[PDB]
Coordinates of C-alpha atoms in Angstrom, one line a residue:
X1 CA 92.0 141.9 112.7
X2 CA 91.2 141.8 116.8
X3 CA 87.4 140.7 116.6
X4 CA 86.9 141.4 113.4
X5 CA 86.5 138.4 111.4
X6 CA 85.2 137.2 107.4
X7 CA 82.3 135.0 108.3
X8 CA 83.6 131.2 109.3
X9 CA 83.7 128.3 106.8
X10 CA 82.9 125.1 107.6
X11 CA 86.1 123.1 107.7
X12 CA 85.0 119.9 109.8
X13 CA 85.0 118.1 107.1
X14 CA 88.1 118.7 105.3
X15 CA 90.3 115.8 106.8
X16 CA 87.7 113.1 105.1
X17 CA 87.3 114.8 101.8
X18 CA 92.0 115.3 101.7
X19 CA 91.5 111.7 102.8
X20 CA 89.3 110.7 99.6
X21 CA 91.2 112.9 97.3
X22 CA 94.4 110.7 98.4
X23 CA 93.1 107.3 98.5
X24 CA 92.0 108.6 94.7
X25 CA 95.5 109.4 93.9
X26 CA 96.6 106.4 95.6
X27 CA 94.5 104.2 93.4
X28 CA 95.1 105.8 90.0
X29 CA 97.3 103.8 87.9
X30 CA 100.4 106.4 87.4
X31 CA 100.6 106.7 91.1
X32 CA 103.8 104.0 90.9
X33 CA 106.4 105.9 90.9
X34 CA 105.0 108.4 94.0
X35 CA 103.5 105.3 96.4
X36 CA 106.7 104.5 98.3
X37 CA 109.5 107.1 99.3
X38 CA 112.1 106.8 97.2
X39 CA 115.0 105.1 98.4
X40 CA 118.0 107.4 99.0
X41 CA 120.9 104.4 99.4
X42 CA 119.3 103.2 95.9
X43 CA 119.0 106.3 93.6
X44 CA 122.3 108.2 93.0
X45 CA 122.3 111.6 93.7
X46 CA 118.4 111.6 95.2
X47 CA 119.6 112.5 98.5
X48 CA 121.5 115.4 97.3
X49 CA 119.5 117.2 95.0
X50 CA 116.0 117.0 96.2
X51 CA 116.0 118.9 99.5
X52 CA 112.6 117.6 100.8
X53 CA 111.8 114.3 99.5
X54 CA 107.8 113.4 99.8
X55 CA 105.4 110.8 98.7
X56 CA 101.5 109.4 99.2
X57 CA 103.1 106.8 102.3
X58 CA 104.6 109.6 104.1
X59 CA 101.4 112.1 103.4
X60 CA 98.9 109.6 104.5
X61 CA 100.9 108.7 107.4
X62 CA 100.9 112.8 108.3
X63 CA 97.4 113.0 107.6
X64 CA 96.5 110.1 109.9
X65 CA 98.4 111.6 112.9
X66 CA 97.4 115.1 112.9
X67 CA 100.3 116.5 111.3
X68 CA 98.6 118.7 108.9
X69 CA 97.5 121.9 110.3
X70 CA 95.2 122.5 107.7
X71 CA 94.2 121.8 104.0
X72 CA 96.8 124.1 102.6
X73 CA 99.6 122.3 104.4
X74 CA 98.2 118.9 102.5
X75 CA 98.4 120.8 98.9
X76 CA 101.2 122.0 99.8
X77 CA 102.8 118.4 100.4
X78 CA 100.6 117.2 97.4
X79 CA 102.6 119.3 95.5
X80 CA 105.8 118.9 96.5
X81 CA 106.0 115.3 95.3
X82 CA 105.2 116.4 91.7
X83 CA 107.4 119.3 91.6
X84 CA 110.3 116.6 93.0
X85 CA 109.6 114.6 90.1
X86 CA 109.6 117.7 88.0
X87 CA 113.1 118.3 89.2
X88 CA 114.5 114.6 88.7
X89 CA 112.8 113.5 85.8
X90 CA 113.1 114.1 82.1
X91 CA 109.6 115.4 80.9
X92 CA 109.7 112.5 77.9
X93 CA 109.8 109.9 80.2
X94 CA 107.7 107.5 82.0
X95 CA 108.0 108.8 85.3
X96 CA 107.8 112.6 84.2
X97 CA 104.7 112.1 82.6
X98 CA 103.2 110.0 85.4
X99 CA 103.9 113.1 87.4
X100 CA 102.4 115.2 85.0
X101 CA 99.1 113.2 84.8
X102 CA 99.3 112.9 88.3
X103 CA 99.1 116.6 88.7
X104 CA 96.5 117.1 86.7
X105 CA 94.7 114.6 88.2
X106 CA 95.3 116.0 91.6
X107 CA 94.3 119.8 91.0
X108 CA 91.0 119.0 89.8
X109 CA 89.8 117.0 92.5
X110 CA 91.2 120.3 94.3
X111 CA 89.0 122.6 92.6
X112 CA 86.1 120.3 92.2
X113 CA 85.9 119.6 96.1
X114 CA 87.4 122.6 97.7
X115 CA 86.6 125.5 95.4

């Protein structure tokens, strides 16, 4: 509350480390399907159904520009991608899996640099 605060934690460095844990997720080879937004004239009913669309372009564009407020705001977008392919994608497919992986993938690095 007023003047009372938990003692501060060092977030200077938290836009380079989101930065590496995206290029990482850029790199990985599943990332195809979650590189580029996906194109709304292209993919029937896309538009429609998936409220907020997001992908790596779009979050490293945000993160570049200052548009994340903090690191939670990145997870959050992270995230959103995944459960979007969740929503869209059969499980036994190509793309639901590469999500899936991708999620994994994702969280860890979370927890291993963060936690």
């Amino acid at each position: 509350s007023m003047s009372v605060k938990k003692p501060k934690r060092d977030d200077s460095k938290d836009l380079a480390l989101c930065s590496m844990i995206l290029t990482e997720m850029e790199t990985h080879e599943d990332a195809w399907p979650f590189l580029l937004p996906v194109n709304l004239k292209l993919v029937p009913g896309y538009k429609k159904v998936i409220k907020k669309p997001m992908d790596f372009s779009t979050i490293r564009e945000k993160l570049s520009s200052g548009q994340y407020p903090n690191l939670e705001t990145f997870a959050l977008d992270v995230r959103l991608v995944f459960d979007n392919c969740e929503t869209f994608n059969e499980d036994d497919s190509d793309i639901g899996r590469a999500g899936h992986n991708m999620r994994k993938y994702f969280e860890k690095k979370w927890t291993d640099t963060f936690k």
